[PDB]
Nucleic acid binder design. Structure first.
Ligand SMILES: C[C@H]1O[C@@H](n2cnc3c(N)ncnc32)[C@H](O)[C@@H]1O
Ligand code: MET
Ligand code: SF4
Ligand SMILES: [Mg+2]
Ligand SMILES: [Mg+2]
Ligand SMILES: [Mg+2]
Length: 360
RNA sequence: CCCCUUCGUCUAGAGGCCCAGGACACCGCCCUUUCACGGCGGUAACAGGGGUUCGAAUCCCCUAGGGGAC
């Protein structure tokens, strides 16, 4: 029953050190070792006297989840499977010219049932602990830091775009993000830590009272009827209820700089027509934003196709004629099922999704 | 008895190069095309106090807070 320090943000680690009679600055010191240096062994922490180091071994540990698989894409993308009990979730490293980004998982699977997502096909088991979330970053930083490969930069950006809906795990997601932003943690910017959500609107309001981070929304449709089909949570919280919650978040936010990112997956002949772009432009006219079009990444048994490049191009041309910043998300790591939406992991579904499927 | 303390974080520094330079963070402006959040700016430190010197982040003394040898 040793306490894992990877579960604690700054505040909780101060109060940890206040107990057992130590001063607040110890929290600062140990976090620097853990996060600036990827240190999991108290012996190596020269900042601290040998008495307090031997004392920490008694009551504490630094335990990130194990990497059990690595795959490398031809485009530079790396996917790691991390062991989480008997199950697994994925972490994805994305090197770009001027930056490097890590996509992190928030849940063991997902319970939201989006029809175009491989993670949904796996079902849902549970939420990840803080240590299991920030541990992905820790473990990726250590692996990337060791092998000094050409064009393989340290992590500058983090996206909550792995397995699971982050807003359904605020207890653990928020503290993990706090450690990403903390100067004594990873020291990342507000503006380059982006949480993506499908729209759990009461939770988005809660998020606003807890932490300010960059925000992307999984819109994927120009109207409620199409969205009800592909992103079922739109039935409980429709587009306007969601867009309103977004505008509330933006009002308090330095991280978003006045703009939400609109995520929009391009499904062939479903939501991808010129007609739909016009309707989407109208829909977003009162929501300051940037549009990120995502070519659909396939998975086994999916009833969709990827929008052709010409259909995507015409869709974006339309949007640009309405004055919207419009970017096609380059597909990264699809040769190793690491592209957005292809993260299957290894999940034990607790929602009886399989036995429900056969009973129609 | 010996070493350590420079912007929020990590650092450049060796008596005039420094009213202290950089990276990232933070803040601000812009995003009507750099986006798996993009572009450009701006604020910001010599642990504290007192000596030495024409001149101190730098040399000396004390104090506060960390290590380390007997
Ligand atoms: C991280 C973003 O990826 C989207 N997403 C989910 N599944 C897929 C898929 N098969 N292809 C492309 N994008 C997908 C999201 O729903 C979210 O907005
Ligand atoms: C694979 S989706 C990851 C982010 C979030 N669950 C969303 O739908 O936007
Ligand atoms: S898309 Fe994001 S939310 Fe919808 S299912 Fe896949 S993961 Fe859960
Ligand atoms: Mg300092
Ligand atoms: Mg940005
Ligand atoms: Mg200055």
């Amino acid at each position: 029953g040793k306490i894992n320090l990877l579960d604690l943000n700054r505040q909780q680690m101060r109060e940890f050190f206040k107990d057992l009679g130590e001063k607040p600055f110890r929290a600062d010191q140990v976090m620097k070792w853990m996060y600036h240096y990827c240190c999991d062994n108290f012996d190596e922490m020269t900042d601290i006297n040998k008495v307090l180091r031997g004392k920490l071994k008694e009551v504490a540990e630094i335990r990130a989840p194990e990497v059990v698989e690595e795959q490398r894409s031809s485009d530079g993308t790396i996917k790691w499977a991390i062991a989480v009990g008997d199950q697994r979730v994925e972490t994805v490293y994305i090197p770009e010219d001027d930056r490097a980004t890590l996509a992190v998982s928030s849940q063991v699977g997902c319970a939201l049932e989006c029809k175009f997502c491989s993670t949904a096909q796996q079902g849902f088991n549970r939420n990840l602990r803080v240590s299991e979330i920030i541990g992905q970053v820790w473990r990726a930083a250590k692996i990337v830091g060791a092998a000094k490969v050409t064009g393989q930069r340290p992590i500058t950006n983090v996206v909550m775009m792995g397995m699971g809906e982050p807003l359904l795990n605020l207890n653990n997601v928020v503290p993990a993000m706090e450690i990403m932003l903390d100067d004594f943690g990873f020291g990342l910017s507000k503006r380059r830590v982006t949480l993506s959500t499908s729209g759990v609107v009461p939770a988005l309001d809660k998020l606003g009272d807890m932490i300010d981070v960059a925000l992307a929304i999984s819109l994927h449709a120009p109207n409620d009827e199409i969205r009800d089909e592909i992103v079922p949570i739109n039935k409980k919280y429709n587009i306007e209820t969601f867009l309103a919650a977004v505008r509330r978040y933006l009002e308090k936010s330095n991280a978003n700089q006045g703009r939400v990112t609109i995520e929009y997956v391009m499904l062939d002949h479903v939501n991808d027509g010129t007609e739909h772009a016009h309707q989407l432009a109208e829909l977003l006219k009162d929501t300051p934003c940037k549009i990120n079009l995502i070519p659909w990444n396939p998975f086994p048994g999916a009833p969709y196709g990827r929008s052709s490049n010409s259909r995507i191009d015409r869709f974006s041309k339309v949007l640009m004629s309405y004055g919207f910043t419009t970017i096609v998300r380059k597909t990264r790591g699809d040769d190793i099922d690491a592209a957005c939406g292809q993260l299957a992991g290894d999940v034990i579904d607790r929602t009886k999704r399989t036995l429900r499927k056969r009973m129609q």
